[PDB]
Amino acid sequence: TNHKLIEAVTKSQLRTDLPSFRPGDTLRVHVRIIEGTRERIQVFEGVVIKRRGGGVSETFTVRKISSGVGVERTFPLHTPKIEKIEVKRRGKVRRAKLYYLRSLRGKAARIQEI
Amino acid sequence: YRKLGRTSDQRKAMLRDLATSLIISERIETTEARAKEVRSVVEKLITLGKKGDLASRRNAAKTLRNVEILNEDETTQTALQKLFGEIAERYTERQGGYTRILKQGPRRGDGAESVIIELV
Amino acid sequence: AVPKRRTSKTRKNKRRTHFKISVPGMTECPNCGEYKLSHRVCKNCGSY
Amino acid sequence: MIQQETRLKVADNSGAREVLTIKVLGGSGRKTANIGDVIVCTVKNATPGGVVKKGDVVKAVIVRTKSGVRRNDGSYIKFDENACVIIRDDKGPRGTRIFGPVARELREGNFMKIVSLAPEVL
Amino acid sequence: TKGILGRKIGMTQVFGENGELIPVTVVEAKENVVLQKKTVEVDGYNAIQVGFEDKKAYKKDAKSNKYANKPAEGHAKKADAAPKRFIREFRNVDVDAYEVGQEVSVDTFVAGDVIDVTGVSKGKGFQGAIKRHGQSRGPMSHGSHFHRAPGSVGMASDASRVFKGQKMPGRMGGNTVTVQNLEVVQVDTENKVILVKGNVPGPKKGLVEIRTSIK
RNA sequence: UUUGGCACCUCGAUGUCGGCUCAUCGCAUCCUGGGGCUGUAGUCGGUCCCAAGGGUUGGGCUGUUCGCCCAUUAAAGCGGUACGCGAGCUGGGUUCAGAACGUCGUGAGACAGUUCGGUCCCUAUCCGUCGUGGGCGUAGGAAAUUUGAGAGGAGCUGUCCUUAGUACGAGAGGACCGGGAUGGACAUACCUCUGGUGUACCAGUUGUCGUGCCAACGGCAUAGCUGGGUAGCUAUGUGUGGACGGGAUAAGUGCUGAAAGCAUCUAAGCAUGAAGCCCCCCUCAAGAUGAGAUUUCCCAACUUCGGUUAUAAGAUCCCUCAAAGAUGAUGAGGUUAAUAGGUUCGAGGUGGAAGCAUGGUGACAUGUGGAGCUGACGAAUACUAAUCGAUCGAAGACUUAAU
RNA sequence: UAAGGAACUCGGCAAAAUGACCCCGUAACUUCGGGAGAAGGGGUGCUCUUUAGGGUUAACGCCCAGAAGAGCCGCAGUGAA
């Protein structure tokens, strides 16, 4: 085979427990920080900016505001360093990428659920 | 893809008028590449009108110009009606091709490796 | 950016050795036709 | 992308409200830098009072670029503005009521001082 | 030691240990067979000859090269074997181990070795100089006329000529290149491929002459 | 490598300082190393010597040649080359014609004392250089793989820690010391990742013309504008690299000698030691006219197998193409065929098609429906075309010794 | 065109950015004329309501609005020039 070979390998590495979502969604994300001492978990909460092509390359991004400070975190999908994921919410979007939100703060940056 | 050393708008317009006239005649004489690249186009138009759906009708009216063949017995119809009423049936069984092409000799003014194109 | 000396004819002809023109194929028509280039429409005394 | 002649905001309470840069130390020919690094700079819009006054020369430290980084995990982090923090030739700051988020990649920079001083870190 | 050939398919990313990301390159080595076994008394050097990939046998009206020719077949037959398509030699290895007719397999390697990959470049075309070489270019305003071209080409009337080794423009092309000291991720044996840390020279479906480093 | 002196070539033209781009050679060496020295305990500074291989910032202020300063850096060298290079760039300054000021001049005008402004031509013939082909030749002909005579390229530093705060030390400073971890810069290979690009992909949207009106489409308006974006090309994005290790070494420093009856870092030894030389690794390389070496395949039927028809191994013409590509060369294929296209599917991308139906006074919304579309990408399918066919293509020379 | 934003340069040359219309506010200095479009702010899409007009008015109607509200949609409403 010249065409199915790659996927035939990398299926060994992929993960399956994960849900399906899309942009518009508000998410909670449990992640396995290994400090020098232990394998402490923490959570990030955010907003589905994007995700691009499939496989291991399926890889996505979330937005947050810390202190009025827009922060963006961008992760693989099938990495092991996620413990868990939650769909906290949906939203009625009409794009596939949400780059048009890095400019705005507040009720300007408001979302309808679903 | 190929450009024809011509601009995009001129190019698109040329191709669509080409395929129009082609549909009128069922074969024509021109150069090589212009035929090479109206080839795939009109193959796809056939792939559309093989279906007769109104959606495809609409999608084709994009490309087909607004033309009138006077068919025999003082009978008239357009390229569209022709396509959806006469030609779909013909290759209704076939799974590609739909055309063929005929190398010929240079022209006088140029080294124009000219070609006839026709239907199959 | 112009000639300093003249072009000797020997040197000219030397240069334009490869300035030539090669030929056409010009087979017969065993398929159908008279003597005419291979695998081709009647160009001269031909059918295929 | 951070080079000299670049405007940095600050995120401490030493007395500076905004700075821009001169340098990026390290090696000869070094042009640029991102988070985890030490520079110099000079303030251009200072806070009335405070320690640090307009026109003064200073070292500092990088935090939270907009051209954020990516780590050995193959994970990425960005921000929506740059920022800096000032130090005291010891990896010790001056202002001590730090604002806003900060990264994690400076534990190795032995600014754990500052991380403990900080809000949420990531 | 432990040479092998294959070709290049693509690159992906892998979550190795520690959740560590690695971009990686895939290699389809296959039907790699010994065809000759040179020597020092016979051929002046102790070495082997290897073919990668079989192809069609002798035929008629063979215009392309999927089909072999008579002497090709005669080489393919002196060992019990078929018509190859790519063939090379190796010296690094010890030959006393090997034996003609073998099918040196992808499983000869493990994950975690040191290798020197040797393939070719893509090759790009005819290229200006700031592309072929790292020549940082000239102004584009303040009333200038020296944008991408080079300027100087040598010295003055003294030595009134132009040295060689100048870095003029030319063709920016496929050429031999041997990286070193990469390493190996996992040694498949069903599709019989290999995964290697990083990138390699050459475009897809090309060719690669893998072997072991030493350092 | 200053100021000059001589006026030999050049005034039927040797036509411009600086700066830009690009260099390249020296060493009378800035970093780098090594030693010896120190008023050096190690470091300090300093002194000498060995050493040129490489490397040897970015800004502010004067056109200023220069120079000063702010930050750094391991250092931020001195020089040569028509005061390196303008048929490669600028012209900021000159020197041009306008003009002003100051001074001098009876004045016309001058100074330089300044000031503002003020036109930089050339289709590359030869050599040369970078790449690319064509021709022919290597005592039989072809295909493929190769040795490599030589040639080119590569050697920069910095840092945390372990040994070791140990030696030195008067502690401070702090080693040489092996490692890994390292970082920078530099050169490389690639687009999996981040991002850009994306003009035949998707959507939205204004004006305006036609399709009678309606919408729907289409045209034109920088691709009409905006958002996104596949393939590929990409870096600011990814991964690599540098180091050694051997000798031969040098300054040297240790050694042992004799002449100079002694001794005294070979004068005949022993050593060691430099980014020095070589090896060391990468690349090109039998036009290496000396033409190499191995393996396989072909071998005039006629026939001094000369020489024709032939012919074979083998090539070429032509044709579908692109991992290649100015061209041509390279490569993949040429019907016993998946080379391209089409068709089908898929991927991926975009973002919920139309038509229905419902809701809604309306704009609009919901479902039908991750819908509908989809260029380069992937598979499959011979539906289309690469079919007929032509041309070339050897006949193993002599000498001698073996045989 | 990322990110930085005149570090380029003799010199921000060039290129960039602004611009229409409506509203609000506009300093110093002045030969009182002006400066001044100073600066600096804000706003414009689409539907329904009229309450109410410019009335298009015969008059609510004709469109523009009296121009005030309520709503619809988009990243974006002198969406172009």
Side-chain angles (χ1 to χ4, degrees), chain A residues 1-34 36 40-104 106 108-109 111-114, chain B residues 1-16 18-72 75-112 114-117 119-120, chain C residues 1-30 33 35-41 46, chain D, chain E:
Chain A
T1 332
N2 53 281
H3 37 109
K4 317 313 194 224
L5 209 186
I6 288 287
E7 56 186 17
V9 187
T10 64
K11 172 259 184 158
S12 58
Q13 207 90 342
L14 190 137
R15 278 167 51 187
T16 85
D17 56 304
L18 307 315
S20 280
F21 56 83
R22 43 175 81 194
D25 296 10
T26 316
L27 278 59
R28 306 176 34 71
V29 172
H30 300 257
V31 21
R32 319 187 296 90
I33 302 108
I34 302 92
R40 167 155 50 89
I41 186 261
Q42 105 189 37
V43 46
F44 186 111
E45 168 155 319
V47 204
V48 178
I49 297 286
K50 72 185 192 179
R51 32 160 20 184
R52 34 61 123 282
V56 288
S57 76
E58 193 72 18
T59 286
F60 75 116
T61 290
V62 280
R63 181 163 169 82
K64 176 183 170 191
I65 321 199
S66 286
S67 313
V69 193
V71 183
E72 320 305 325
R73 203 81 191 283
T74 280
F75 283 113
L77 226 81
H78 310 290
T79 165
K81 273 186 160 51
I82 295 178
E83 187 185 30
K84 153 190 175 207
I85 285 178
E86 320 170 16
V87 166
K88 227 191 79 219
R89 201 164 65 148
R90 298 267 139 185
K92 180 159 191 180
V93 287
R94 298 198 68 167
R95 305 267 149 289
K97 280 98 182 296
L98 307 183
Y99 300 130
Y100 71 109
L101 268 51
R102 290 135 164 183
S103 44
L104 318 186
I111 296 168
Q112 283 180 339
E113 176 169 16
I114 291 148
Chain B
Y1 21 82
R2 285 165 178 159
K3 330 208 201 176
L4 320 199
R6 205 181 280 230
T7 55
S8 196
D9 52 356
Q10 287 179 292
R11 165 163 67 204
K12 148 170 166 189
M14 197 237 296
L15 267 45
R16 61 186 285 173
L18 223 58
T20 308
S21 39
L22 169 288
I23 289 281
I24 314 311
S25 56
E26 313 198 10
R27 53 159 45 205
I28 49 176
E29 184 170 17
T30 191
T31 104
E32 171 159 321
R34 315 201 320 186
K36 293 282 212 85
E37 308 309 315
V38 76
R39 165 169 66 165
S40 74
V41 162
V42 75
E43 279 169 313
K44 291 172 199 213
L45 272 82
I46 284 149
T47 331
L48 293 229
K50 226 157 143 139
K51 302 172 184 174
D53 53 294
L54 188 62
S56 64
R57 162 76 60 82
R58 294 280 177 74
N59 310 348
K62 291 173 154 39
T63 293
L64 305 199
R65 307 293 190 175
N66 314 305
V67 200
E68 300 220 328
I69 296 175
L70 178 271
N71 256 314
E72 311 308 329
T75 63
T76 322
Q77 51 140 15
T78 70
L80 190 80
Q81 301 175 234
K82 196 206 191 74
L83 171 49
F84 276 30
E86 310 195 43
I87 297 137
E89 41 261 275
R90 289 177 31 179
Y91 318 89
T92 191
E93 172 51 38
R94 224 175 307 209
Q95 282 73 44
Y98 304 93
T99 44
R100 54 172 59 273
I101 237 175
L102 305 175
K103 294 227 253 267
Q104 298 198 326
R107 295 194 298 164
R108 183 167 163 256
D110 331 298
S114 61
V115 172
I116 286 166
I117 188 160
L119 276 351
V120 87
Chain C
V2 312
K4 169 71 69 136
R5 277 264 55 94
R6 45 163 31 197
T7 22
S8 34
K9 302 197 289 194
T10 152
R11 210 163 278 259
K12 157 158 53 165
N13 303 132
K14 274 177 164 181
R15 114 173 143 237
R16 58 175 72 182
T17 172
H18 283 113
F19 183 81
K20 317 171 65 156
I21 157 161
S22 66
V23 314
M26 196 198 68
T27 76
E28 6 70 296
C29 237
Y35 202 85
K36 67 135 274 278
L37 63 174
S38 266
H39 319 333
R40 184 61 175 275
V41 180
Chain D
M1 184 53 42
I2 249 163
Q3 53 219 21
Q4 65 182 65
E5 306 280 339
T6 304
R7 278 284 153 81
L8 274 162
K9 201 177 288 182
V10 219
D12 81 326
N13 49 316
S14 69
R17 210 193 285 86
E18 174 158 15
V19 79
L20 76 83
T21 162
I22 281 178
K23 229 71 197 305
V24 195
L25 60 114
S28 175
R30 171 54 170 287
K31 291 285 290 268
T32 62
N34 205 312
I35 293 160
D37 300 341
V38 186
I39 79 186
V40 324
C41 43
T42 42
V43 292
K44 297 282 167 189
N45 183 8
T47 312
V51 174
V52 294
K53 320 307 301 177
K54 210 191 76 159
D56 302 341
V57 155
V58 280
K59 298 184 81 183
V61 76
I62 316 312
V63 295
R64 68 140 168 288
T65 52
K66 199 190 302 91
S67 57
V69 315
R70 135 271 187 72
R71 350 189 162 195
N72 302 34
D73 59 1
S75 309
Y76 280 78
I77 170 59
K78 271 174 178 53
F79 299 94
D80 295 9
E81 83 306 348
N82 306 259
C84 216
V85 155
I86 321 199
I87 69 95
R88 195 191 335 96
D89 75 85
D90 61 343
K91 305 186 295 223
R94 311 299 194 70
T96 57
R97 188 119 76 172
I98 290 164
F99 348 92
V102 176
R104 185 176 302 287
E105 298 286 9
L106 39 180
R107 198 86 54 72
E108 48 260 38
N110 296 324
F111 314 107
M112 63 324 236
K113 168 53 166 157
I114 315 195
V115 193
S116 62
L117 290 155
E120 37 70 31
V121 161
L122 30 56
Chain E
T1 83
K2 285 174 30 170
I4 247 288
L5 333 176
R7 50 172 58 193
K8 169 184 201 163
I9 354 292
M11 285 161 78
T12 50
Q13 62 283 14
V14 164
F15 310 118
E17 210 72 353
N18 322 135
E20 186 69 5
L21 189 64
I22 301 165
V24 75
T25 318
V26 54
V27 172
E28 178 166 1
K30 199 163 70 187
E31 57 249 308
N32 307 75
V33 285
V34 170
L35 267 55
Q36 265 215 23
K37 160 156 62 181
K38 268 68 179 282
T39 348
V40 74
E41 68 202 328
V42 186
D43 320 285
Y45 61 104
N46 327 48
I48 95 190
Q49 184 161 53
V50 179
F52 162 55
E53 161 162 11
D54 63 338
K55 70 183 204 176
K56 259 60 141 50
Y58 190 87
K59 217 197 79 188
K60 217 93 299 192
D61 309 54
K63 308 187 177 174
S64 76
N65 200 46
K66 67 176 83 148
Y67 318 90
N69 49 43
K70 295 232 296 119
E73 298 268 24
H75 211 216
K77 225 160 298 332
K78 188 171 285 187
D80 320 11
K84 291 287 120 182
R85 193 145 192 182
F86 305 77
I87 297 88
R88 296 293 183 286
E89 312 194 356
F90 293 77
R91 302 260 279 284
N92 48 353
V93 312
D94 173 61
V95 72
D96 305 330
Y98 294 83
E99 175 261 20
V100 49
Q102 274 169 10
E103 314 87 323
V104 164
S105 178
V106 73
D107 62 73
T108 308
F109 297 135
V110 318
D113 301 344
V114 271
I115 52 174
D116 310 336
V117 165
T118 295
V120 311
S121 4
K122 284 187 280 292
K124 318 298 206 312
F126 192 79
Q127 308 308 149
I130 69 201
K131 203 116 182 174
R132 283 175 42 111
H133 303 84
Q135 289 241 321
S136 208
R137 61 82 150 70
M140 306 306 315
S141 69
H142 285 5
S144 177
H145 281 117
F146 165 65
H147 302 184
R148 313 191 66 123
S152 188
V153 283
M155 303 139 61
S157 82
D158 198 316
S160 42
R161 61 200 193 69
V162 175
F163 290 78
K164 45 182 68 171
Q166 177 53 209
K167 299 176 174 58
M168 281 198 177
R171 195 178 239 161
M172 193 65 184
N175 25 96
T176 54
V177 34
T178 77
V179 318
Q180 315 191 3
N181 294 337
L182 313 200
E183 67 102 329
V184 207
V185 160
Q186 68 193 39
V187 197
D188 184 301
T189 14
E190 319 189 356
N191 310 265
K192 312 113 161 288
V193 321
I194 303 193
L195 297 180
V196 207
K197 196 169 75 87
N199 70 308
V200 291
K204 310 205 286 260
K205 59 182 82 183
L207 179 74
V208 282
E209 317 191 357
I210 301 170
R211 72 211 73 192
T212 316
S213 323
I214 43 157
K215 306 295 182 171

